[model samples]
Target: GIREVILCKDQDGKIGLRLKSVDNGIFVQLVQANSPASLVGLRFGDQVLQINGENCAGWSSDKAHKVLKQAFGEKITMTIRDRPFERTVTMHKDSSGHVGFIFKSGKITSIVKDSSAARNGLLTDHHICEINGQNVIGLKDAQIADILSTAGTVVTITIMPA
Candidate 1:
């Protein structure tokens, strides 16, 4: 589930890389749309594995970020190793008879367009893990179906994105 991509910097000497620390690894937070990194295929969930041959496996998120920031000094390459994961997404039904969107196969797979999930932002890798402070970790698709099927109007979802 992990892979790499080569990247470069912008004309103004920037790679436009935003990083985040989740668990024990540093991950790619955001890549600017027009930046060289994006043009070169870097993505939002990619994890930073190395910087120009320097192993970042044991580096802190801030340290990795520092190295990445300093990498633009002259010219440098960022090697991102992306490891896929299944995370939990938390969503809620508000007070308006709109629990927002639908669920997929016990997993909060997709969000309906212009729906509550879309509006409330339920993109925690589309895996619904909790409900109203309860753990939905091992619930069945039909169970989730029944829950979402009998909801109110609002939604409060939390998908730990770091």
Candidate 2:
């Protein structure tokens, strides 16, 4: 799931990509079609693990942006990971002992106001990737409901954007 690429800047010294830092690490937010980043196979949601061998896991979004900005003329080496970068969120049950979100099938349908899910940044439209370390891909809505019904007070879920 790891990949490396060398990007050659375009006439405008642009790589045609954008980065957004999440709670965990930086991710590719945008990759202009047919640009250097796109041509090199970069896509939205890909995790940017490193740039020029620098571990950017702890860097802020602006910091990573600055590094990419200054490496235009030079050969910009990037270590990227496929997939939308899994976000592991530990949601503690609310006062009602619920995770505070409603879902349909694999997608988060809504979030209860002032719930732990909202506090943890869980948003509607995102899809559930894993539930308590178990893969929930392709599982039916009722199936997921069963898993949730059996879950404990503290549940760790991995989600990715739609």
Candidate 3:
């Protein structure tokens, strides 16, 4: 049953990360704002070179899924190339937890209007620290999703005043 659980897909028009040939690394495409993937520092057009120290070269999607499952609950190391440069990143599994708000360092860029953020009095240039009692730092988008999905209710968040 575990074998049936993991499945891979070829390039589709979906607005998310795309993987080609498993070895070429995981490639990011369109990014959804406020989604778990975007919040975790993944951007469009990034090339994933390795996952958890395993080279992805020529591996089928299923094979890659298997590797990911094994690395679940463990920190995964990744090598990424954005063409002219490369960087190593450490990724952690998305545990089922609480979704929280985070403030990016430096000048604030964009803020969506009329979303929960706006209604909660969050403003541009405000530093956010907690979301429904959960810390905002060092969290991945998937983890956020797990929390939000499980909570099944709107959560009140706290933030720093601008």
Candidate 4:
């Protein structure tokens, strides 16, 4: 089975992956790159079949995540689909595959150096005017967040580079 050890590294040494269920099968949804699971090589879409030695059959997203977060920051092991992860690309998906960028303070402030975002021409301090024609200019925080939350996966961020 695919196995991974989620090792927390923050000062508090406590964390968890964002989770969601599909087809009644619980799966890892998002694991921030700097996040414990990602740093340990875990990826999104990995199917989790167990939790802390307990079968995941009755586990809700909340319960399973709590098991890891409360595991006292100790490395937690999980049973996955057992097949190699088939990632066509990485996160901050631009629908053009991963377009690596992280936003802050209600706007994208930087493009990870050498990241796909850099390759795609994103620059620091750029204001997003549109996302695939959504007219994101002057958009509220939540509305803007939803667009970027999908990042490269479902967006084509048209920016006015700064």
Candidate 5:
């Protein structure tokens, strides 16, 4: 039976992916962690261009899923266009797939308005020292997300005003 995947809040207080149709490309939205799409460097709003080596310019979601299941072991190449830059990358399905750049805790550049941190009065010039009692001085993006996701609920992050 074909598994129908949907985006629902998981037990970790984060969204879960339920596969629906493959020909429609990926239907799940990118979260902070546990997203294969994000691990593969697929950003928000990037359309699925291809699967394996097959062109998916007009492919449906269901069909795309079939190809994905078959290409589990093989390298999956995708052509993604970010603004004026069009790039192709062969994505490897692995544990470290979605890991982005490293983040060192110190200064806060900008804070999103209405976010949890912002609502808590976290300012833009503040320094984030710890999150949920854990020091994040030299942690990667994925590592930070992992702790927050596993911890669940509102995490207390220590911040120092600049």
Candidate 6:
């Protein structure tokens, strides 16, 4: 759900990841698949919340890049969150009040065939992090069930693939 102390050292003098400013945050725009960034588990779409102990919450991509360029070390540390494949999906519950998936320990176990979840791209093995904007990571099954049951017919959930 959250990661810190992500270390990346240069190869060919490049850390091999691009940062982008989206709205109010600096996020990983692109990561070379086989580069230091990727090798260290950095992924596209990860929000770089902090860099080298500097808060990057409101940083523009330009400023972030400049900082990285001016840094004097071989390795830089990043505090990243919402790693790649983390996304939100809005689904309409079926008449049976099912979003069309089974989950255990926050992980999707199956996608109900021909259901809204299937049609809406609910993939198996993805971890559910938020339910209608409520953080549900590490929440017990009963608590998660309560959220789902209370969320009306249309629900939005945030999930990340394992």
lDDT of 1 by residue, 69-102 (tens): 7774556766666535334334445555555665
Model 4, span 83-142: residue lDDT tens: 243322223554445567766544677677766676756656766655653446566877
The digit string of per-residue lDDT tens for model 3 on 60-96 reads: 6566556655555323455666533222111121243
lDDT of 5: 0.43
- Count of backbone collisions in candidate 2: 0
- Clash total of candidate 4: 6
Per-residue lDDT of model 6, residues 1-162, tens digit only: 778865556666678878878778888766665778878777656788888888887788899999877767788888888655548788999888888889998899998899989999887888787788565767898899999989999988877666
Model 2 earns a TM-score of 0.54
lDDT of each: 0.60, 0.82, 0.43, 0.60, 0.43, 0.80
Best by lDDT: 2
lDDT of 5 at 8: 31
Backbone collisions counted per model: 13, 0, 5, 6, 18, 0
Q: What TM-score against the true fold does each predicted structure earn? A: 0.52, 0.54, 0.32, 0.46, 0.31, 0.52
Better of 3 and 6 by lDDT: 6
Candidate 5 shows a clash count of: 18
Cα lDDT tens digits, model 5, 63-147, are: 6556555554323444544322221111121242321122345556765444554444455565554555455544666676676
Global Cα lDDT for candidate 2 = 0.82
| Model 1, TM vs. native | 0.52
| Residue 152 CA displacement from its true place in model 1, Å | 21
Score residue 105 of candidate 3 by CA lDDT: 54
Cα displacement (angstroms), candidate 6, residue 62, comes to 0.9
Two-way lDDT contest, 2 vs 3, winner: 2
Model 4 segments more than 4 A misplaced: 4-6, 82-162
Give the Cα error of residue 114 in candidate 4, in Å: 33
